[PDB]
Amino acid sequence: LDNGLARTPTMGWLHWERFMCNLDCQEEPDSCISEKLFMEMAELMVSEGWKDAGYEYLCIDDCWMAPQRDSEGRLQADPQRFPHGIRQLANYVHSKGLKLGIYADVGNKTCAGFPGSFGYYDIDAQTFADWGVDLLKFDGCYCDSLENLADGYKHMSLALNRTGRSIVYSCEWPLYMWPFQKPNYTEIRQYCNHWRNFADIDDSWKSIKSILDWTSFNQERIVDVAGPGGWNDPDMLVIGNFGLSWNQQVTQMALWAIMAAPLFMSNDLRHISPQAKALLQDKDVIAINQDPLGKQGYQLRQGDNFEVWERPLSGLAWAVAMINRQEIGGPRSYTIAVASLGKGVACNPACFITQLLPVKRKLGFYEWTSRLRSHINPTGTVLLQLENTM
Amino acid sequence: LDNGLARTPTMGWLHWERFMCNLDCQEEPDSCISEKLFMEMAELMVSEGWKDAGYEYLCIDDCWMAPQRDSEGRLQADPQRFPHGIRQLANYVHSKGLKLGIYADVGNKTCAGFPGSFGYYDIDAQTFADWGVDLLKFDGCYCDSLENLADGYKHMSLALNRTGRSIVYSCEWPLYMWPFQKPNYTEIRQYCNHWRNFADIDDSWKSIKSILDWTSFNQERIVDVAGPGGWNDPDMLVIGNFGLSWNQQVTQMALWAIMAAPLFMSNDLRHISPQAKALLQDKDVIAINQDPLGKQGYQLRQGDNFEVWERPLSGLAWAVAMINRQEIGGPRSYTIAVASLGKGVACNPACFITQLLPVKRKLGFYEWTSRLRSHINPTGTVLLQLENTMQMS
Ligand SMILES: *[C@@H]1O[C@H](CO)[C@@H](O[C@@H]2O[C@H](CO)[C@@H](O[C@@H]3O[C@H](CO)[C@@H](O)[C@H](O[C@H]4O[C@H](CO)[C@@H](O)[C@H](O)[C@@H]4O)[C@@H]3O)[C@H](O)[C@H]2NC(C)=O)[C@H](O)[C@H]1NC(C)=O
Ligand SMILES: *[C@@H]1O[C@H](CO)[C@@H](O[C@@H]2O[C@H](CO)[C@@H](O)[C@H](O)[C@H]2NC(C)=O)[C@H](O)[C@H]1NC(C)=O
Ligand SMILES: *[C@@H]1O[C@H](CO)[C@@H](O[C@@H]2O[C@H](CO)[C@@H](O)[C@H](O)[C@H]2NC(C)=O)[C@H](O)[C@H]1NC(C)=O
Ligand SMILES: *[C@@H]1O[C@H](CO)[C@@H](O)[C@H](O)[C@H]1NC(C)=O
Ligand SMILES: *[C@@H]1O[C@H](CO)[C@@H](O)[C@H](O)[C@H]1NC(C)=O
Ligand SMILES: *[C@@H]1O[C@H](CO)[C@@H](O)[C@H](O)[C@H]1NC(C)=O
Ligand SMILES: CN1C[C@@H](O)[C@@H](O)[C@H]1CO
Ligand SMILES: CN1C[C@@H](O)[C@@H](O)[C@H]1CO
């Protein structure tokens, strides 16, 4: 989408995976989907260094709406859980130097059952723009036809453009198309800043594995379309929650960097370990994810329960990730000729290699004839940056 | 097995899950199956407080043998990887105050392909006894018939008895029967100190879940068989490795305590986080696992992606574990009437409840009519101890 936005993958925070559709503010005031929760997240995004690291978009997902539209047919936030309204919340978020994302649905209802936007694309777009919304995630539930799906996504894209406000447009179009026909990614990229390809992530290593396996299986179809203004979205970062071991969190961070993925944290910023915070705020890994060249990486090799992925970077640099998919035993040795990396260009005549994950370590100079040997933890990933000696 | 051993579930360390059958001591010296590895593991078991916590048996698994037997027809340790032999390794292990476990197979070969014990049961038992072995894990690979499997397990049990040396006998008999017929657990318990029921564990939450689900599915068949001298073995503790989140590690520790399981760590004691160490050395949870009553716990309730397990303890106490099996979202609230716990005995007339996991916190006095409210993390477990009491506050 050539709206001048998302020139690097969007970074921010999205409530869905961690907080879902919790409406019980009587019994659970501190985790229900409310204006107070988003105020607290915004405060911590500023105070705990998230904004400094690049996490900029504070995004509302499903279950913010009142059960019905107002008298004039516009969407409204729930009166009790969002007493001051979305425009006021956006004002507060902007006063912190942050941007506000919101959620809507192309069909007749949101996935959780709140008002859909079908029939209201222009009024809903203008409402969001009036509110000061900076991002829209557009879900695909309750849509009866592929025609309605495509027409709705394109229509909302154009309506957002017509409002004249810069609004990042996040689509689930491909995901809801795939069961029936193959998405045309050129068209999607024409209309969307990023797009969900695969099933919702949850707080599990199984989820990570299946997202990675789907991405690598379909990479011939999705890798080359990505670039500044339009990214593949493998869904939220779940680092800092409950289901991932340290090495699985490392794997998610490293490979979301390799895949030039939007980095939407979905966790509790009020209760997050120092270790998870340091991983999510890792300057070198984020810099890889945010590389201005914007070329999505890919799986280079697969075998012996090992995976090698790589991503071309600005200025003749490359990122290389090595995953150990064997879920038994200990750190396993993997070796590869450096001439086999970066299409044979990365280390010709030589490269300096710096390991970034799980720990940062200068590995030294590697000649074009050299072999890179590493030990990779079960379900963990080793992430490396290669700098050609020029 | 009435040999006076394993009156509580055996505690120790077993190399299999973390180190497997790594024979490449040239290119992978730090993880190959060698005598140096076991010497160092013993040193850290003493120095790092594992022995104090109760972990006593340093156990060799598969891939310690030379490719074939000696001239005298006995097993021998691998000349390259165990140059000083099992007798000297056992002497060293005993000098640290520990006991040595070893591995063998009922069939013609070990699962990794080394000499089996069929045809040599008495010589192998006497070999181990001469070496100073204190525990034997007896695998079931390369056995063609239930005839041979059963006869071999019974035979090796009696052969070990014949030596006059106290040797804990760990069997995989039930697990290897399943392809043919359901185990007779009274008979197995007659011959074994503990027995593997289910497929090998690996370093994954999927593995923990499948072991737990199998155990709770089959609990009417196996729970009552367990007791002092004979335990169900749900396989090794994998806390301290790579595949489990903190909450999943808590779940494994809590429920291995609930199940009166043998506690065989399989990790690298040289590279283990302080948090995993504190969990594995948790005095109160180990005390639950080691409760002298020796009655195995069970799944009390299941539903809405929640599980409630409980274990009766000596002196009218109970352990209660609450698992959140929903793998999305945040901590979920669960409430239960205390009268539904401990068969209605735990909190009659009252109980004092102490949470032990994920953190230790006294919750207070709960009267028989009261309700317990808790919040449980996704894939985590809340472990509680209920102490029956006649006091009210
Ligand atoms: C070879 O097999 C035989 C049996 O097939 C086995 O003999 C058994 O040994 C056990 C353990 O020593 C005996 O049980 C003990 O019996 C005495 C006398 O009746 C009791 O005082 C003992 O009580 C103590 O230990 C108990 C735990 O076992 C505690 O519950 C108790 O509080 C006491 O501390 C204990 O019950 C058993 O009587 C014999 N059985 C027979 C038939 O002789 C022998 O040990 C085996 N040998 C080897 C090397 O495995
Ligand atoms: C509406 O769409 C137009 C055209 O697709 C966008 O115009 C582009 O804006 C970028 C940066 O602002 C320029 O580099 C391109 O050259 C522009 N293209 C054209 C054809 O003018 C415009 O940004 C969109 N407006 C909104 C509010 O989304
Ligand atoms: C996928 O969609 C794109 C855009 O809708 C199609 O590309 C257009 O093709 C027409 C020819 O019919 C050209 O006039 C346009 O210039 C193209 N646009 C772009 C941006 O390339 C493309 O044909 C579609 N692919 C398939 C297989 O249907
Ligand atoms: C919404 O519902 C109406 C009537 O039930 C139907 O005609 C229309 O196609 C629906 N829209 C979508 C996007 O499913
Ligand atoms: C071991 O191999 C011999 C030789 O073929 C065979 O006769 C015997 O039955 C085997 N034993 C077992 C337990 O499989
Ligand atoms: C199981 O084996 C034991 C030992 O022979 C015997 O006492 C018991 O009756 C057997 N049970 C069945 C069901 O055969
Ligand atoms: C099912 N949708 C897609 C998922 O990403 C959330 O946005 C949820 C909201 O209902
Ligand atoms: C497959 N066996 C059973 C498992 O517990 C190990 O002992 C392994 C040795 O080869």
PDB file of C-alpha atoms in Angstrom, chain A residues 16-20 27-28 201-206 241-249 326-333 373 375 377-379, chain B residues 16-20 27-28 31 201-206 241-249 326-331 333 373 375 377-379:
ATOM      1  CA  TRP A  16      -5.725  -9.926  21.658  1.00  0.00           C
ATOM      2  CA  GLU A  17      -3.527 -12.918  22.497  1.00  0.00           C
ATOM      3  CA  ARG A  18      -2.926 -11.991  26.135  1.00  0.00           C
ATOM      4  CA  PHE A  19      -6.256 -10.348  27.048  1.00  0.00           C
ATOM      5  CA  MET A  20      -8.709 -11.615  24.389  1.00  0.00           C
ATOM      6  CA  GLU A  27     -14.615  -9.633  38.711  1.00  0.00           C
ATOM      7  CA  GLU A  28     -11.441  -8.765  36.737  1.00  0.00           C
ATOM      8  CA  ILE A 201      -1.097 -17.545  17.072  1.00  0.00           C
ATOM      9  CA  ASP A 202      -1.507 -18.784  20.608  1.00  0.00           C
ATOM     10  CA  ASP A 203       0.850 -19.148  23.578  1.00  0.00           C
ATOM     11  CA  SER A 204       2.528 -22.339  22.424  1.00  0.00           C
ATOM     12  CA  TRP A 205       5.609 -23.684  20.673  1.00  0.00           C
ATOM     13  CA  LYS A 206       3.308 -25.756  18.442  1.00  0.00           C
ATOM     14  CA  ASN A 241       3.674 -14.766  28.443  1.00  0.00           C
ATOM     15  CA  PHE A 242       3.514 -18.399  29.664  1.00  0.00           C
ATOM     16  CA  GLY A 243       3.771 -21.064  26.958  1.00  0.00           C
ATOM     17  CA  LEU A 244       7.231 -20.532  25.451  1.00  0.00           C
ATOM     18  CA  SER A 245      10.526 -21.585  26.973  1.00  0.00           C
ATOM     19  CA  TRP A 246      13.405 -19.116  26.752  1.00  0.00           C
ATOM     20  CA  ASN A 247      14.820 -20.811  23.654  1.00  0.00           C
ATOM     21  CA  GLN A 248      11.405 -20.825  21.954  1.00  0.00           C
ATOM     22  CA  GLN A 249      11.049 -17.101  22.680  1.00  0.00           C
ATOM     23  CA  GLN A 326      14.978 -31.784  17.470  1.00  0.00           C
ATOM     24  CA  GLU A 327      13.049 -31.653  20.756  1.00  0.00           C
ATOM     25  CA  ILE A 328      15.236 -34.090  22.716  1.00  0.00           C
ATOM     26  CA  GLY A 329      18.860 -34.200  23.814  1.00  0.00           C
ATOM     27  CA  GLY A 330      21.169 -31.229  24.174  1.00  0.00           C
ATOM     28  CA  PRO A 331      22.823 -28.488  22.119  1.00  0.00           C
ATOM     29  CA  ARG A 332      23.393 -29.993  18.682  1.00  0.00           C
ATOM     30  CA  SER A 333      26.246 -29.166  16.316  1.00  0.00           C
ATOM     31  CA  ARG A 373      30.124 -24.265  13.154  1.00  0.00           C
ATOM     32  CA  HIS A 375      25.770 -25.469  18.699  1.00  0.00           C
ATOM     33  CA  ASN A 377      19.720 -25.652  21.670  1.00  0.00           C
ATOM     34  CA  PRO A 378      16.641 -27.853  21.149  1.00  0.00           C
ATOM     35  CA  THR A 379      13.816 -25.576  19.926  1.00  0.00           C
TER      36      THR A 379
ATOM     37  CA  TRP B  16      19.150 -40.659  28.717  1.00  0.00           C
ATOM     38  CA  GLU B  17      16.943 -37.690  27.810  1.00  0.00           C
ATOM     39  CA  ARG B  18      19.681 -35.049  27.897  1.00  0.00           C
ATOM     40  CA  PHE B  19      22.632 -37.093  26.615  1.00  0.00           C
ATOM     41  CA  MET B  20      21.074 -40.081  24.786  1.00  0.00           C
ATOM     42  CA  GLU B  27      33.857 -34.088  18.216  1.00  0.00           C
ATOM     43  CA  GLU B  28      31.356 -33.916  21.128  1.00  0.00           C
ATOM     44  CA  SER B  31      28.032 -34.738  25.911  1.00  0.00           C
ATOM     45  CA  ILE B 201       9.474 -38.539  27.433  1.00  0.00           C
ATOM     46  CA  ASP B 202      11.188 -35.850  25.411  1.00  0.00           C
ATOM     47  CA  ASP B 203      11.921 -32.149  26.009  1.00  0.00           C
ATOM     48  CA  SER B 204       8.487 -30.803  25.155  1.00  0.00           C
ATOM     49  CA  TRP B 205       5.185 -29.691  26.662  1.00  0.00           C
ATOM     50  CA  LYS B 206       3.430 -32.032  24.215  1.00  0.00           C
ATOM     51  CA  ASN B 241      16.688 -28.349  29.732  1.00  0.00           C
ATOM     52  CA  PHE B 242      15.246 -26.294  26.829  1.00  0.00           C
ATOM     53  CA  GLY B 243      11.700 -27.190  25.770  1.00  0.00           C
ATOM     54  CA  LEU B 244       9.521 -26.335  28.782  1.00  0.00           C
ATOM     55  CA  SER B 245       8.498 -22.857  29.866  1.00  0.00           C
ATOM     56  CA  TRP B 246       8.694 -22.038  33.576  1.00  0.00           C
ATOM     57  CA  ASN B 247       5.006 -22.792  34.071  1.00  0.00           C
ATOM     58  CA  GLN B 248       5.353 -26.107  32.229  1.00  0.00           C
ATOM     59  CA  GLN B 249       8.316 -27.026  34.448  1.00  0.00           C
ATOM     60  CA  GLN B 326      -5.945 -23.396  27.936  1.00  0.00           C
ATOM     61  CA  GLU B 327      -2.888 -22.328  25.928  1.00  0.00           C
ATOM     62  CA  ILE B 328      -3.992 -18.755  25.187  1.00  0.00           C
ATOM     63  CA  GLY B 329      -4.888 -15.688  27.207  1.00  0.00           C
ATOM     64  CA  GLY B 330      -3.884 -15.055  30.789  1.00  0.00           C
ATOM     65  CA  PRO B 331      -4.334 -16.478  34.284  1.00  0.00           C
ATOM     66  CA  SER B 333      -9.864 -18.059  37.755  1.00  0.00           C
ATOM     67  CA  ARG B 373     -10.488 -19.349  44.745  1.00  0.00           C
ATOM     68  CA  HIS B 375      -5.783 -18.106  39.477  1.00  0.00           C
ATOM     69  CA  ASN B 377      -1.409 -19.565  34.459  1.00  0.00           C
ATOM     70  CA  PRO B 378      -1.773 -21.067  30.964  1.00  0.00           C
ATOM     71  CA  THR B 379       0.012 -24.462  30.958  1.00  0.00           C
TER      72      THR B 379
END
